[PDB]
Enzyme design. Structure first.
Site, PDB file in Angstrom:
ATOM      1  N   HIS A  44       0.822  -1.194   0.000  1.00  0.00           N
ATOM      2  CA  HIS A  44       0.000   0.000   0.000  1.00  0.00           C
ATOM      3  C   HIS A  44       0.869   1.262   0.000  1.00  0.00           C
ATOM      4  O   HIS A  44       0.364   2.393  -0.087  1.00  0.00           O
ATOM      5  CB  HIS A  44      -0.878  -0.001   1.218  1.00  0.00           C
ATOM      6  N   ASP A  93      -0.476  -6.991   2.125  1.00  0.00           N
ATOM      7  CA  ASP A  93       0.182  -5.699   2.067  1.00  0.00           C
ATOM      8  C   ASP A  93       1.675  -5.971   2.061  1.00  0.00           C
ATOM      9  O   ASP A  93       2.354  -5.820   3.075  1.00  0.00           O
ATOM     10  CB  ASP A  93      -0.206  -4.864   3.285  1.00  0.00           C
ATOM     11  N   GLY A 186       4.036   6.920   8.321  1.00  0.00           N
ATOM     12  CA  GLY A 186       5.415   7.115   7.905  1.00  0.00           C
ATOM     13  C   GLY A 186       6.276   5.886   8.111  1.00  0.00           C
ATOM     14  O   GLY A 186       7.331   5.739   7.486  1.00  0.00           O
ATOM     15  N   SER A 188       5.060   2.766   7.666  1.00  0.00           N
ATOM     16  CA  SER A 188       4.603   1.672   6.824  1.00  0.00           C
ATOM     17  C   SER A 188       5.756   1.097   6.018  1.00  0.00           C
ATOM     18  O   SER A 188       6.702   1.803   5.655  1.00  0.00           O
ATOM     19  CB  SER A 188       3.483   2.142   5.923  1.00  0.00           C
ATOM     20  N   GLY A 189       5.688  -0.191   5.727  1.00  0.00           N
ATOM     21  CA  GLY A 189       6.790  -0.804   5.017  1.00  0.00           C
ATOM     22  C   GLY A 189       7.919  -1.117   5.986  1.00  0.00           C
ATOM     23  O   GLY A 189       8.825  -1.895   5.682  1.00  0.00           O
TER      24      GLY A 189
END
Length: 237
Positions: A44, A93, A186, A188-189
């Site tokens: 995402h 995701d 911020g 995410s990942g």
């Protein structure tokens, strides 16, 4: 990261900061180094991204101020997203970034181990979430890589906090019953490093959550062990 602490340079060598150059350069997401030319991250995190030509991966970075015009970086050659991914809250995701050049491992940037279907029953008691994400629901990207130790929670316990969703076995959560520490905008990942046996294993990928660090609202991460086969399939072209 909410309720975390400034990391130590070199502490999380597999952590990377994914930047975008459109309209202007800025931190987009986090990622983890898993191969000389492979970055594991959140699908995402690529919403609105048409070409990987605007992507820039920065390794071995502690503070965002180290990143300027003259800072070397890794371009992205290809963006690979799961074929069954529609959105964060719906799982899958997960995405891979094939770097245009190879990463020269070192103390400042090294890969993290991927769990195996064998340790699918292992219980990680030492897990940390890192990133330059928000410190509060309404904050901004943090300059210094923040870290925070968060306990894992059974998918059953998690599902209990998100009665509006479906916490699949391909999701993993972590959080304090009273909140306080958690990933945020911020991050995410970002990787969900867990030390087990003197070795760090990429357990989850910061995906989503309701708000940030709220009580009885554990953070949701992509259960990486459930994707080992996918990662192998996509990394061999």
């Amino acid at each position: 990261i909410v309720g975390g602490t400034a990391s130590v340079r070199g502490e999380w060598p597999w952590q990377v900061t994914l930047h975008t150059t459109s309209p202007t350069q800025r931190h987009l997401c986090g990622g983890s180094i898993i191969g000389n030319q492979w970055i594991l991250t959140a699908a995402h995190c690529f919403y609105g991204v048409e070409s990987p030509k605007i992507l820039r991966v920065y390794s071995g970075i502690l503070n965002q101020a180290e990143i300027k015009e003259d800072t070397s970086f890794f371009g992205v050659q290809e963006i690979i997203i799961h074929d069954q991914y529609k959105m964060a809250e719906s799982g899958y995701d997960i995405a891979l970034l094939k770097l245009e050049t190879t990463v020269n491992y070192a103390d400042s940037q090294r890969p993290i181990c991927l769990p195996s279907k064998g340790d699918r029953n292992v219980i990680y008691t030492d897990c940390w979430v890192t990133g330059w994400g928000y410190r509060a629901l309404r904050d901004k990207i943090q300059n210094t890589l923040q870290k925070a130790k968060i306990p894992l929670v059974t998918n059953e316990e998690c599902q209990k906090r998100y009665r509006g969703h479906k916490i699949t076995h391909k999701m993993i959560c972590a959080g304090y019953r009273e909140g306080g520490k958690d990933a945020c905008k911020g991050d995410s990942g970002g990787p969900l490093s867990c030390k087990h046996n003197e070795v760090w294993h990429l357990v989850g990928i910061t995906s989503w959550g309701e708000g940030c660090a709220q009580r009885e609202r554990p953070g949701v991460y992509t259960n990486v062990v459930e994707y080992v086969d996918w990662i192998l399939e996509k990394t061999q072209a």
